[PDB]
Structure formats: structure tokens, C-alpha cells
Design a protein around this ligand. Structure first.
Ligand SMILES: Nc1nc2c(ncn2[C@@H]2O[C@H](COP(=O)(O)OP(=O)(O)O)[C@@H](O)[C@H]2O)c(=O)[nH]1
Length: 217
């Protein structure tokens, strides 16, 4: 019998990866230099500390090397629950190797991860794994809300954290707790959601090109 991928997803082209990666780093630069962020650094550095500034690019030291991606289904070669069902779908097999455009609507930062929120079209939503055997997965939010691109992680943080972070952030925006924007960056508005959580809503959605395929490690 045949190995499944470690995970399925959309893998950005060289150019799109470069473009999104640069946007993420610029965001980390501006955020770290933003007065509202520094006023709340108690959520990134603990204890009575010298009043210095944190370089977020350095903070998120575990970064994706090379090509960026948006995961759909983690399969672990077929060991993960629902892995085979997902892989056997017609739409997954039909879409394998095909090009897509992913709309990135926001960039976010928590004390654990940094990433970009992806807003899937309905065609692309067809490639999002069914939560019907684990509605814990998407936590009351529309399907595919977890869709993201990871831009960086803190040293002690597991890779899957980014998706959980995004859902947490979106969960607040659902209850209307993003509050009044606390800053206006060149690319959009900065929101302070508390607990070291920050969201930049892009004025203009970023459009990235990516191939849907499988990663085998
Ligand atoms: N999404 C997801 N990832 C898992 C799960 N269990 C383990 N992982 C980890 O996810 C890693 C690969 O995820 P990755 O695509 O890099 O993270 P993402 O880009 O934030 O979705 C692997 O190293 C696994 O150890 C799971 O149930 N779901």
C-alpha cells in the first residue's frame, strides 16, 4: 500500500513566497517599533526588565525555510485520523498539482507565532478537510477559518500553534472584541486584541500563487 504525504496543502511559488515573506518581516519591523506594542511588551518579556526594545524578527527565530505553504490536511503518511478519507476524495485527487490563488487578508502576531490569515474561496474550501468527526477543530467558526501561512514561531513553540493562534484571534473578532484600532500602518490597521495578540487587517488583500500538492518530509 502507498504512503500518503506528511500533509497536503498549497505551496506558494518562489515569487509569492518571497513577496509574502517580505511583507511578514516588514510587519514585524513596524510592529516592534510601534508605540502601542512597546507599551504592552509585558506579554513578550517577563519580569522587571531593562526598558529595551524587542526585535520580533529575532523573537520568531524558527522560520519556514524557503517555500511557504498553507496546510489543508495533516496526514502523517496516513497515520492521522481522517487522512485516508481526505486523500481519497475526488476533489483532492483532481486538484493535485493544480495552481490556485490564495487571498491573504491579515497578518498576525502572538507571543507564540506569527503568520498570515488566508481566506479560501469556495472552490478552495472544497479542499479543506471535513470537521464532521471533530467539530472541536474549527471551534464554532466557519470551515477553513484556520487556513493560514506560518511566518515564524518562538523557540519553544510547536508548528501547529499558528493555526490555533489564528482561530483564537478570529474567535475574538467574532464576539466583537478586536476593539477600536490602535494604529494605522502603511498596509492596513493595527488591532490590539490583548494577551500579546496583534492583528493587521490589510487594506488590500494580498494575492499569492500556489500549487496544491503533497509534502513528504
Ligand atoms: N495541523 C496539524 N498538525 C499536526 C497534528 N499533529 C501533529 N502536527 C504537527 O504539524 C507539523 C506540520 O505542520 P505544518 O504544516 O508545518 O504547520 P502549519 O503550517 O501551521 O499548518 C508536523 O511536524 C506535526 O508534528 C494535527 O493533528 N494537525
Amino acid at each position: 500500500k502507498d504512503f500518503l504525504p506528511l500533509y497536503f496543502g498549497w505551496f506558494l511559488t518562489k515569487k509569492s513566497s518571497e513577496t509574502l515573506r517580505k511583507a511578514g518581516q516588514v510587519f514585524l519591523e513596524e510592529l516592534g517599533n510601534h508605540k502601542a506594542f512597546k507599551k504592552e511588551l509585558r506579554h513578550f518579556i517577563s519580569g522587571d526588565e531593562p526598558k529595551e526594545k524587542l526585535e520580533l524578527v529575532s523573537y520568531f527565530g524558527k522560520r519556514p525555510p524557503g517555500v511557504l505553504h498553507c496546510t489543508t490536511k495533516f496526514c502523517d503518511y496516513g497515520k492521522a485520523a481522517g487522512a485516508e478519507e481526505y486523500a481519497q476524495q475526488e476533489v483532492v485527487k483532481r486538484s493535485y498539482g493544480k495552481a490556485f490563488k490564495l487571498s491573504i487578508s491579515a497578518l498576525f502576531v502572538t507571543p507564540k507565532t506569527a503568520g498570515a490569515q488566508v481566506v479560501l474561496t469556495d472552490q478552495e474550501l472544497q479542499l479543506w478537510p471535513s470537521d464532521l468527526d471533530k467539530p472541536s477543530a474549527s471551534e464554532g467558526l466557519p470551515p477553513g477559518s484556520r487556513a493560514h501561512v506560518t511566518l515564524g514561531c518562538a523557540a519553544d513553540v510547536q508548528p501547529v500553534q499558528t493555526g490555533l493562534d489564528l482561530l483564537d484571534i478570529l474567535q475574538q473578532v467574532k464576539g466583537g472584541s478586536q476593539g477600536e484600532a490602535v494604529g494605522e500602518l502603511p498596509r492596513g490597521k493595527l488591532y490590539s486584541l490583548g494577551k500579546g495578540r496583534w492583528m493587521l487587517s490589510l487594506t488590500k488583500k494580498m494575492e499569492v500563487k500556489a500549487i496544491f500538492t503533497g509534502y513528504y518530509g
